[PDB]
Nucleic acid binder design. Sequence first.
RNA 1: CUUGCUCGGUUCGCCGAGACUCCCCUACGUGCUGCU
DNA 2: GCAGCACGTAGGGGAGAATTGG
DNA 3: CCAATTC
Length: 498
Amino acid sequence: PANFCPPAKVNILAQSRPLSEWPINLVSKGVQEYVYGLTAAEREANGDFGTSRKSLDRWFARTGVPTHGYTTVQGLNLILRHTFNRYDGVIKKVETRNEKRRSKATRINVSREADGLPPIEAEPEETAFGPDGKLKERPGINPSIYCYQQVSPVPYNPAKHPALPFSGVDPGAPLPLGTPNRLSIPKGQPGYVPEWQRPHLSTKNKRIRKWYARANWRRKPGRKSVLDEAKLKEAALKEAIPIIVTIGKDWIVMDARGLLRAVYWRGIAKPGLSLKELLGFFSGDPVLDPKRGIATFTFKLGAVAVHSRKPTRGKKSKELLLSMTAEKPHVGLVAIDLGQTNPVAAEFSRVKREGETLQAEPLGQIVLPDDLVKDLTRYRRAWDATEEQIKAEAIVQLPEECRAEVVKVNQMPRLSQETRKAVNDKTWELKRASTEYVRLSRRKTELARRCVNYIVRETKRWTQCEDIAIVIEDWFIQVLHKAFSDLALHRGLPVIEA
RNA sequence: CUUGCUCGGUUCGCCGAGACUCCCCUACGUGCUGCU
DNA sequence: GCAGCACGTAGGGGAGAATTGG
DNA sequence: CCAATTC
């Protein structure tokens, strides 16, 4: 039973007015501001919002949060239930911490009592509420508009929707395509392929990029072109696929080509499908991001065919392998010991079902290709280059009393175990706001996933088995282990540890 | 495989290769050693 | 258990749709 | 046609 719904993001093309000014956003912000300030006793009093119209009306009347004109039951149930669950979230954190601590105390003290030692004094368990009645760690306001059934996206129709300069496709008509006859574009026209790179054109299933894509015109050291943005923007808008969400009086228009590519690269749909089916492949409750301009869709329960299991280990591993050998009698394991030198070392095997025990059959080993290692080396160069800059910038912004001590640390004694905390905090703050650091941190994840995908692809070729299993042991060590453990969560492939 | 993102080559006319589980929010923690 | 190192980690909350009633 | 109930 498939139970995983990966996201798919689309771009906002136009708005009636900025998303932060909508009544839904205002009522969400007001509710979030009000609820978090409630004390421990006040939550029980103001915890009867109810899933009905009368209950919601009396909740808004009893308190003083302005409804801001937004009075929709489907949508206020999402705002209130999420907001009160965040209030219980901070309580649940300290509750589970104290539960683990009390289990430790119960084990240790009962063991000592069995040994005759009296139990130690009970520790002052932490409370989530501050001095008078307020939460110490007050939850922050969550900026997001959670769409619902009554405002589900629909294909654009100029008749019943506000007029915008770009056109709108027919919901029932088959969706358009790129340019198949790419080699037939005459010289001097957009998309023209010169007569020197025609032979070494890819034959594989590459994703087709249109000539106005930003990837073909962005600024890199080798690109001696011009990045005129207006021309690319209008050329891209001329061929958009608009879908619209109307919440009350406001509306928003999205570009649906993101959904098209999401269903295309996953292979769930083939070229030649309508917009109605394309929207039917996704949930009718997207999420709007006011800060970026991205609406995030998630696939329906059934669109993807993965199970999203857990990395079982220990005793359950043998039973998992036995059950899988009860399925098609060819299981190809791979061992991912992150050994010396190369970041990845693999060792394929095959096991049968010999009654009760397994019969492993070795099949050899493989190392990472040289191009991938070159890419990893270049990434590490870039990461170290940005690290040597951000650390220096953090050191510069330290207070003079701490700055002198840190300078002495650089100079050549190792002391001052009170400014290490300040250095750590300043470094975390700088890292959280450095855009280049975010880009290089996403690059690490992308490269790690590239390595895992390569290993999975090669482990299906050597063993010639469709179903595979992964064995791991507990720089790139942590990131690669995380990327390999995500396969159970994301793609459903079992991930055994040791 | 039409948008968006990342890395490269160029004759600058665009084509070679990738990831696709993502968001907010609050805390200062996590592993590796040296001695008790 | 209690210091020195590097490096980000940990843990709360999210991410619908059939029906049906005026 | 569109909110409101329900699980």
